[PDB]
Amino acid sequence: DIEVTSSPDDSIGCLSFSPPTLPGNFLIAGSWANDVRCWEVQDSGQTIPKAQQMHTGPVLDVCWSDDGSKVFTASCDKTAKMWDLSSNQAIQIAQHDAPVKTIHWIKAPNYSCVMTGSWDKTLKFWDTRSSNPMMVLQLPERCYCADVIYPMAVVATAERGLIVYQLENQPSEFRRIESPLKHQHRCVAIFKDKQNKPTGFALGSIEGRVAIHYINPPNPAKDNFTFKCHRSNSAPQDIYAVNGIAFHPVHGTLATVGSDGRFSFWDKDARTKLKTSEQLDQPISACCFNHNGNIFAYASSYDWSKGHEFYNPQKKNYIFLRNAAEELKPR
Amino acid sequence: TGTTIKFNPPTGTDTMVSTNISTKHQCITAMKEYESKSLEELRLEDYQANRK
């Protein structure tokens, strides 16, 4: 697979492509070198480093604003910035008492804000122009991952917390869900129905297991299921952690990346494994899609899965781009 | 605080489909000593203590 030119110097933790409101395609990446980077992707795959910004702590999550003019960052320095791209100016819009793990843009018919999930056990909402959060919500534990598709939001916490929020008029809790996985939550992604409305989410743990959960299925005992993944195998089977999960925006099928250095494509309706790649020299840390699903990006970096004894600061961190949306087409 | 204890993949059992298999778990937070923190938390602490 084709590399991205001038990749960061440390491990990558998040990826995010540009919205459809922008011409062309653009990729954002956050690394543990406290830097945020941008690449203009050509139709031929050639990547052009466009800009860069820096935090005082490792960047954990990134996202775009709806109109394509801003890029939001979440760092371990307990803050979060807004990055105007035409002027290349980054100011602070968010403050926390602990590292910020998740960041999302919420485009409601009646408001628009930035959501920040942090390890200080809270969930704040910012209007990008005032220093006070317009709303603060309480989490029962540290925030590990999240996702936002109006009018639905899902947040996974430590101690296997799982909360679903409604966003109409103003955000608030909808229901706290007993987790269908019995290990540490890690990544989550929301999928929609045939009428383009959010209906459920996909939860991934560190135990090579991903759960499919619908909000209101007719028969949840048979509709909601859990499946194994990212396990390399008479002999013991190595169980690796799921580090990221994202859905194809056109075909409704999903992809998964794990500590096994592989990425797999899945169909949850037919309940089938579409593809599984080769074993990269190091685990795959993050992934995402572009706006029309024709570009699948995934980053090859260390994930601290085996501790600090296995961190090699000289192994090259790569970002790969795969122009295969038809590998995710169902039959 | 930090990955000061050496990694040791915990052992387990499971079935696969139709037989009985054994499992090694290749995640440091699957051990009892790190079950209360995440990977990013442990990694962040090893950085601030200059244990890279």
């Binding site: 299921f225 859990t226 499946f227 194994k228 899945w266 309940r271 089938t272 494994k273 579409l274 593809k275 599984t276 039959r331 | 696969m16 489909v17």
Partner: peptide, 9 residues
């Protein structure tokens, strides 16, 4: 590679 059925619990 080719299509395989999911390993579901």
């Amino acid at each position: 590679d080719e299509e395989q059925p999911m390993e579901i619990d």
